[PDB]
Design a protein around this nucleic acid. Structure first.
Ligand SMILES: [K+]
Ligand SMILES: [K+]
Ligand SMILES: [K+]
Ligand SMILES: [Mg+2]
Ligand SMILES: [Mg+2]
Length: 136
RNA sequence: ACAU
DNA sequence: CGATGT
């Protein structure tokens, strides 16, 4: 319907899928970059989108902020709601880092509480999410 | 089919 | 064109 401008927007960026994964969070109103994750050598788009939301939850909780989070990823929103990232990515030596970070994010969700609304960014109506990397 |  | 996901 209407954009909630008082919000945090998150997005993944990648080089290949699977490939090098990063993510960032921005103030929806102003575009100010609030956090950026150092690139992870091998991961998937959906793992990165999941980590971005969970990082947003942790960022907002530490700052006592009740703002919602926007994500464009139907998959990642569902994984966060379930507290379980149902990724198909093989677990091997090459993917150990991303899977460690995903496991740690699930662990955080299972030991902490939050009321943050996690909202779908409506790309078909509103254009690209404000945290997008501009690579498509 | 839809969402990345 | 290829991939990740519900
Ligand atoms: K998009
Ligand atoms: K992009
Ligand atoms: K498909
Ligand atoms: Mg996205
Ligand atoms: Mg994007």
């Amino acid at each position: 319907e209407e954009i909630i401008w008082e919000s945090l927007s998150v997005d993944v960026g990648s080089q290949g899928n699977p490939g090098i994964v990063e993510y960032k969070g921005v103030d929806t109103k102003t575009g100010e970059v609030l956090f950026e994750r150092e690139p992870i050598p091998i991961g998937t788009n959906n793992m990165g989108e999941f980590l971005a939301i969970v990082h947003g939850l942790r960022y907002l909780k530490e700052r006592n902020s009740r703002k919602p989070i926007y994500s464009d990823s139907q998959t990642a929103i569902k994984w966060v709601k379930d507290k379980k990232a149902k990724s198909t990515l093989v677990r091997n030596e090459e993917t150990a880092l991303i899977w460690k970070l995903v496991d740690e994010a699930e662990e955080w969700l299972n030991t902490h509480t939050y009321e943050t609304p996690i909202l779908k960014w409506q790309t078909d109506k509103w254009g690209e999410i404000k945290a997008d990397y501009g690579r498509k």
